[PDB]
Amino acid sequence: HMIVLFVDFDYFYAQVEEVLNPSLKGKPVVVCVFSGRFEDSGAVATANYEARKFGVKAGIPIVEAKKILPNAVYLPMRKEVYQQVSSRIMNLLREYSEKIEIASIDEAYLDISDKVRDYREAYNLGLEIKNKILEKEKITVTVGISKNKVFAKIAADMAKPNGIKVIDDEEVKRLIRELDIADVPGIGNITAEKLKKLGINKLVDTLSIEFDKLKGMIGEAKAKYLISLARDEYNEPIRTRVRKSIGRIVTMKRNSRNLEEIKPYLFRAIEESYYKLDKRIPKAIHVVAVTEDLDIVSRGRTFPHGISKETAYSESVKLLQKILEEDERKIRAIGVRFSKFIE
DNA sequence: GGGGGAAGGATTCA
DNA sequence: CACGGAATCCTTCCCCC
Numbered sequence: 001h002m003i004v005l006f007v008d009f010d011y012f013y014a015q016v017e018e019v020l021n022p023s024l025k026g027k028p029v030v031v032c033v034f035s036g037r038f039e040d041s042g043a044v045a046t047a048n049y050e051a052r053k054f055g056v057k058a059g060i061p062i063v064e065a066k067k068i069l070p071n072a073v074y075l076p077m078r079k080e081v082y083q084q085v086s087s088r089i090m091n092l093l094r095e096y097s098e099k100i101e102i103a104s105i106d107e108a109y110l111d112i113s114d115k116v117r118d119y120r121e122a123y124n125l126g127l128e129i130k131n132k133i134l135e136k137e138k139i140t141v142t143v144g145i146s147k148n149k150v151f152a153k154i155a156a157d158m159a160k161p162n163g164i165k166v167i168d169d170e171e172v173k174r175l176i177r178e179l180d181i182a183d184v185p186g187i188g189n190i191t192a193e194k195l196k197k198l199g200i201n202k203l204v205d206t207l208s209i210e211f212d213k214l215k216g217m218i219g220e221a222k223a224k225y226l227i228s229l230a231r232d233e234y235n236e237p238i239r240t241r242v243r244k245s246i247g248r249i250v251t252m253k254r255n256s257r258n259l260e261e262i263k264p265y266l267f268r269a270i271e272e273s274y275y276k277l278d279k280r281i282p283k284a285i286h287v288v289a290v291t292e293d294l295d296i297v298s299r300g301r302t303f304p305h306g307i308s309k310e311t312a313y314s315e316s317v318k319l320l321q322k323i324l325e326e327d328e329r330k331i332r333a334i335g336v337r338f339s340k341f342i343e
Numbered sequence: 344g345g346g347g348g349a350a351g352g353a354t355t356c357a
Numbered sequence: 358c359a360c361g362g363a364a365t366c367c368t369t370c371c372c373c374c
């Protein structure tokens with residue numbers, strides 16, 4: 001009953017840069033996000049394995065990477081490029097199933113149930129998909145196969161990189177008991193911790209705790225999710241998913257609270273955001289700010305009609321005004337987010 | 344009491 | 358010193374029948 005095949009491209013941004021400049025293949029490559037603030041201020045979008053080996057990875061400051069690997073190749077993130085390559089591969093996967101859910105810029109779940117019997121065939125289809133993607137785009141990915149999206153995903157995690165793996169029903173039962181609950185999708189450090197205090201260290205433990213306390217501790221939705229898995233009864237279908245919001249945010253040269261100093265950044269964000277909107281019309285706008293102490297403050301508003309760029313400019317100004325008046329810290333970054341698209 | 348929303352923020356993942 | 362971006366969930370305050 002139902003066979004899910006999850007595809008996860010390998011160290012995606014770095015690998016795409018390798019493909020576009022093979023002279024890179026073989027040496028450590030780090031894709032970065034730089035912000036004027038200073039010489040090498042920014043974070044690491046990601047890096048290839050010939051770099052992950054020494055700890056350089058997503059989230060750490062570019063400077064830190066530089067110390068560890070001073071002579072590695074540091075590339076500016078070219079999101080737009082990775083996107084179009086992503087779209088191409090996404091098309092290429094449709095050829096294998098109508099039921100396709102695009103999770104992110106490099107993730108996708110395929111429902112190959114009414115498409116192929118047993119696991120032995122699932123596997124092959126896997127290898128087939130890899131080859132095709134590999135030959136067509138020269139991009140290696142990892143394929144996870146199991147009874148649902150959750151374990152399909154976990155599968156790939158286990159099989160990374162450029163791998164493939166199937167978690168059979170017998171194994172599922174083993175992981176519901178042996179797999180560290182932390183390693184379960186949707187469980188970050190915050191929840192992980194919350195779970196330990198409650199004694200829960202495995203997906204199974206959830207079955208030995210009174211709901212209401214669990215629900216009370218991690219929220220009902222997270223509780224039902226986990227319990228669901230533990231009972232080997234999880235079964236969310238693979239559905240299409242359209243964007244629900246679009247935004248842009250930029251880090252300023254220096255901190256500030258001066259409206260007239262921030263406004264320019266904010267307006268660049270809006271202009272950029274509208275271009276990205278294309279033909280979509282938003283009913284809601286939020287102004288998101290990152291404070292000096294790396295905290296995130298936001299203020300929004302929904303209109304009974306769509307928002308025009310003019311409308312956005314003036315309304316974004318008030319929300320920034322509101323933020324300032326309601327939060328004493330200097331603002332480090334400023335952005336906008338449009339949502340609730342008409343239709 | 345409880346439905347229907349909006350707003351501000353928490354948590355997670357890429 | 359820690360960047361862009363986006364979804365989902367949760368708490369809370371409201372209006373109101």
Ligand SMILES: Nc1nc2c(ncn2[C@H]2C[C@H](O)[C@@H](COP(=O)(O)OP(=O)(O)OP(=O)(O)O)O2)c(=O)[nH]1
Nearest residue numbers: 009010011012013044045046058059106161357361
């Ligand atoms: N800007 C930014 N982008 C990120 C971050 N994390 C991931 N990404 C982007 C670039 C990654 O290549 C892409 C896929 O993330 P994964 O979590 O799949 O990492 P990646 O595919 O690079 O390596 P992998 O082989 O999956 O371990 O998402 C992040 O922290 N900041």
Ligand SMILES: [Ca+2]
Nearest residue numbers: 008009010011
């Ligand atoms: Ca990946």
Ligand SMILES: [Ca+2]
Nearest residue numbers: 008104106107
């Ligand atoms: Ca991914």
Ligand SMILES: [Ca+2]
Nearest residue numbers: 182183187188
């Ligand atoms: Ca985890």
